[PDB]
Short mmCIF file of N, CA and C in Angstrom, two decimals:
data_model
loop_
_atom_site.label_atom_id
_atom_site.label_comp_id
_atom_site.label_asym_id
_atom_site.label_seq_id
_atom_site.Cartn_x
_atom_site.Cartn_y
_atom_site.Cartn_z
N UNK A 2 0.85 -1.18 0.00
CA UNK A 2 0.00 0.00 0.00
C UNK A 2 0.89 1.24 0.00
N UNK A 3 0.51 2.51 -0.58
CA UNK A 3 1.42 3.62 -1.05
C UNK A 3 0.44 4.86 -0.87
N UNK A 4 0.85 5.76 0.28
CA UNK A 4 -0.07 7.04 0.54
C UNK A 4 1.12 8.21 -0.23
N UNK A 5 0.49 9.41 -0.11
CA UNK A 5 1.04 10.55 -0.40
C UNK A 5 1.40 10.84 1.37
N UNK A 6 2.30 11.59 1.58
CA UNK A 6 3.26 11.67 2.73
C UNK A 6 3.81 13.03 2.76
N UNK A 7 3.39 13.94 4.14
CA UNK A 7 3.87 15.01 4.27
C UNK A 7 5.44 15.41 4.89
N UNK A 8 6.39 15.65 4.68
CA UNK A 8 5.69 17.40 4.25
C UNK A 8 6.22 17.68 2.85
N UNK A 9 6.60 16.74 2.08
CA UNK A 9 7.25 16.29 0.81
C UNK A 9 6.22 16.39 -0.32
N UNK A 10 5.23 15.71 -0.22
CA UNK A 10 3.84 15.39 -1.03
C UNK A 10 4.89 14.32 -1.90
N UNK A 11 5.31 13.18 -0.92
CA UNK A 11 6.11 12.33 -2.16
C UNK A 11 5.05 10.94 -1.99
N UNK A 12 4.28 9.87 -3.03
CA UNK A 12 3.84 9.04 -2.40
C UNK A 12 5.05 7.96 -1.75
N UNK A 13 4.82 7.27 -0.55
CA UNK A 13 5.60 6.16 -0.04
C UNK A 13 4.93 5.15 0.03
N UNK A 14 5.87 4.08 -0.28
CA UNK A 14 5.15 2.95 0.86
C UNK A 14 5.38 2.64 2.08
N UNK A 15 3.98 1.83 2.28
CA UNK A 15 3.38 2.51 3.92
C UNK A 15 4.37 1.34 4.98
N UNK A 16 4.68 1.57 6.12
CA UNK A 16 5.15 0.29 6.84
C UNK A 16 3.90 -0.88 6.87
N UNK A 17 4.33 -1.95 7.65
CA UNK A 17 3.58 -3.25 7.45
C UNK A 17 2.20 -3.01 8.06
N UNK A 18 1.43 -3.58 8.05
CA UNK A 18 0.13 -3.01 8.99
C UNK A 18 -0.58 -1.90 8.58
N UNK A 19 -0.15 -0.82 8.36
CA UNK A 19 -0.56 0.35 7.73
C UNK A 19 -1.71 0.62 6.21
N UNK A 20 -2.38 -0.04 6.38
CA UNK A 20 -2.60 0.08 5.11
C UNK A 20 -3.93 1.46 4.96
N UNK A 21 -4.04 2.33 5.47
CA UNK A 21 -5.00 3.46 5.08
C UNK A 21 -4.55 4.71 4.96
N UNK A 22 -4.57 5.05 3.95
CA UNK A 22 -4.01 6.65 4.09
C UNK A 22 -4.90 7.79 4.33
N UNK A 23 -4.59 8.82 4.78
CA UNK A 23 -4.92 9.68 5.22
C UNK A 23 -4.66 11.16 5.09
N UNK A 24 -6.16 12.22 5.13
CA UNK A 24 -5.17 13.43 4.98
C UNK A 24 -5.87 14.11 5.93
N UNK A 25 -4.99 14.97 6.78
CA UNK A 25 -5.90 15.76 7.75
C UNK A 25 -5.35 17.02 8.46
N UNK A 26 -6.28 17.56 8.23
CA UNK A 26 -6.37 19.21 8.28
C UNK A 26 -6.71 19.97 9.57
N UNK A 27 -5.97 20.61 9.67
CA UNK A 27 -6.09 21.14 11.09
C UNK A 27 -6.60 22.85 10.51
N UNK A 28 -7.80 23.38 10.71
CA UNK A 28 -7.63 25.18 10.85
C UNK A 28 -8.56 24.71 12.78
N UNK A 29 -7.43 25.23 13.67
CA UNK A 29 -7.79 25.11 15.17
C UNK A 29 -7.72 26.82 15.42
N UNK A 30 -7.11 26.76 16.57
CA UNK A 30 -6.82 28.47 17.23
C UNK A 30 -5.93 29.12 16.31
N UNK A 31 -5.35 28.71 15.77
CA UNK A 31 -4.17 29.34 14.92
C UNK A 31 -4.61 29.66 14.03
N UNK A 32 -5.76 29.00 13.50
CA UNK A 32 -5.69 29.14 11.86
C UNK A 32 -5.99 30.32 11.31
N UNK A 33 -6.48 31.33 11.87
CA UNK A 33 -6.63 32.53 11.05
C UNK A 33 -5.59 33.37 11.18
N UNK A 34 -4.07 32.98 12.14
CA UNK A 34 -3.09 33.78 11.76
C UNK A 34 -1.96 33.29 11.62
N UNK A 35 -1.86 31.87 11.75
CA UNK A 35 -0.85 31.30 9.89
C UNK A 35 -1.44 30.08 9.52
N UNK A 36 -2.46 30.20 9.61
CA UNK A 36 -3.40 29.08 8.45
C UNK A 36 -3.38 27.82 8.75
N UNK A 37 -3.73 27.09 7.71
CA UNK A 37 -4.35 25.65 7.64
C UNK A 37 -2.56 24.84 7.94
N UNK A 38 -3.36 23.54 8.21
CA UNK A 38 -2.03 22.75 8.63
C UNK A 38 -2.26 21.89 7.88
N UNK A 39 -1.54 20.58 7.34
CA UNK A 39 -2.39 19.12 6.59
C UNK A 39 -1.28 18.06 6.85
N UNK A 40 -1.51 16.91 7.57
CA UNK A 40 -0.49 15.79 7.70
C UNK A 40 -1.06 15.07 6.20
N UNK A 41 -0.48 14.34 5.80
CA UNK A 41 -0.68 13.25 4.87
C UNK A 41 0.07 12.54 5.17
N UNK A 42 -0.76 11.08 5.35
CA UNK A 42 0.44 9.91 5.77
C UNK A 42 -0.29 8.55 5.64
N UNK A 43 0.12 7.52 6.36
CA UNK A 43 -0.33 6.01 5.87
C UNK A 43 -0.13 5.91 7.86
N UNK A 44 -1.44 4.83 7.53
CA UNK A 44 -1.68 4.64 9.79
C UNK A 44 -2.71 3.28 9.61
N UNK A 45 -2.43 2.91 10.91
CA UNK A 45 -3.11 1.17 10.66
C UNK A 45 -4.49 1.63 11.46
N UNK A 46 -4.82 2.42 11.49
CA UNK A 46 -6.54 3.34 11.32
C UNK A 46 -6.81 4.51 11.66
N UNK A 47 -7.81 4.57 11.34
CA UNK A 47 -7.74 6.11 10.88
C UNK A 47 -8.07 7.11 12.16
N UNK A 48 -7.11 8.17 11.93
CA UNK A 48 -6.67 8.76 13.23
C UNK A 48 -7.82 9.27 13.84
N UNK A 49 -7.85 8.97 15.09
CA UNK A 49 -9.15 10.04 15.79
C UNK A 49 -8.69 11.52 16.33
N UNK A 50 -9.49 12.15 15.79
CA UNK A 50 -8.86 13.69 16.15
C UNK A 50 -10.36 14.44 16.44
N UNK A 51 -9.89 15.87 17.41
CA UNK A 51 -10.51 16.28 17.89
C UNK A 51 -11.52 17.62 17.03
N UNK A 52 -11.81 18.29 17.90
CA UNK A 52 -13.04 19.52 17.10
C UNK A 52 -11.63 20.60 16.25
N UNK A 53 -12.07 20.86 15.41
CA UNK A 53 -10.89 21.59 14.94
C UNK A 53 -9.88 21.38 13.62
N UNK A 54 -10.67 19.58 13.39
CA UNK A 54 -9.49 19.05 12.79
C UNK A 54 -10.31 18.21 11.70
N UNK A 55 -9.89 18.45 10.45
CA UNK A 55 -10.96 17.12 9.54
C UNK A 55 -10.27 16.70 9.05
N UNK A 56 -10.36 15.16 9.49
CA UNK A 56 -10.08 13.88 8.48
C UNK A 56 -10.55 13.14 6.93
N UNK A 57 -10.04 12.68 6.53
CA UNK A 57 -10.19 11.60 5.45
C UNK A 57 -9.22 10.36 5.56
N UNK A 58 -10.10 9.55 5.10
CA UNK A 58 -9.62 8.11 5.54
C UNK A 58 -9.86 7.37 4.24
N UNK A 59 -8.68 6.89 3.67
CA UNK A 59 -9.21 5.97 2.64
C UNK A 59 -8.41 4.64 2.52
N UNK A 60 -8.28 3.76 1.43
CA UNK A 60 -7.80 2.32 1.86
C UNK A 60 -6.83 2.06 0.17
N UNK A 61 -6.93 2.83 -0.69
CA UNK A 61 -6.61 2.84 -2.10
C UNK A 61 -4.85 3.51 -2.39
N UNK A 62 -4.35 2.60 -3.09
CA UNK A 62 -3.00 3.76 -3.53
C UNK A 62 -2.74 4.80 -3.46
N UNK A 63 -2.24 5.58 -2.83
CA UNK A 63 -2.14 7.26 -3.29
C UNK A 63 -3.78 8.01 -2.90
N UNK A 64 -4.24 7.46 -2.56
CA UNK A 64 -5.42 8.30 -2.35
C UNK A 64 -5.88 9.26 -1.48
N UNK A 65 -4.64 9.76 -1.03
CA UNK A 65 -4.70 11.06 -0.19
C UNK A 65 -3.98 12.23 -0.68
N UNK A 66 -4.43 12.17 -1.94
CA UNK A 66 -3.48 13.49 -2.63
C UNK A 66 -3.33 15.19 -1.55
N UNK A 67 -2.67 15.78 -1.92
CA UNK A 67 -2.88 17.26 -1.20
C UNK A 67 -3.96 17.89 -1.45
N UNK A 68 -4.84 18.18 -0.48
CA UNK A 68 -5.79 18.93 -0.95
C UNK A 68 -5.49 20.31 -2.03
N UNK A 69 -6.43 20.80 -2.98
CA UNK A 69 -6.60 22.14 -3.31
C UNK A 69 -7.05 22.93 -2.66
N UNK A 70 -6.65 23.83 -2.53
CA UNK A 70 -6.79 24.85 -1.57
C UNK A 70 -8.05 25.74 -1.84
#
């Protein structure tokens, strides 16, 4: 399995176990004075995160491209 991977935007492959990639966005307290944040990475499920923060979770090659802004 092969996610897109921050802070590079290079896809990798994922370690063993790992097979979902992910992209997730943080605009929290900060975000209106230096903006959005975004991990992209590969995790053996999909991360739980708090108010503040949106996920995507998928199970496919590369399927966590960088968002457009």
């Amino acid at each position: 399995t092969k996610c897109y991977v921050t802070p590079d935007v290079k896809s990798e492959t994922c370690p063993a176990g790992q097979d979902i990639c992910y992209t997730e966005t943080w605009c929290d307290a900060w975000c209106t004075s230096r903006g959005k944040r975004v991990n992209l990475g590969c995790a053996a499920t999909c991360p739980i995160v708090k108010p503040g923060v949106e996920i995507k979770c998928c199970s496919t090659d590369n399927c966590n491209p960088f968002p457009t802004r």
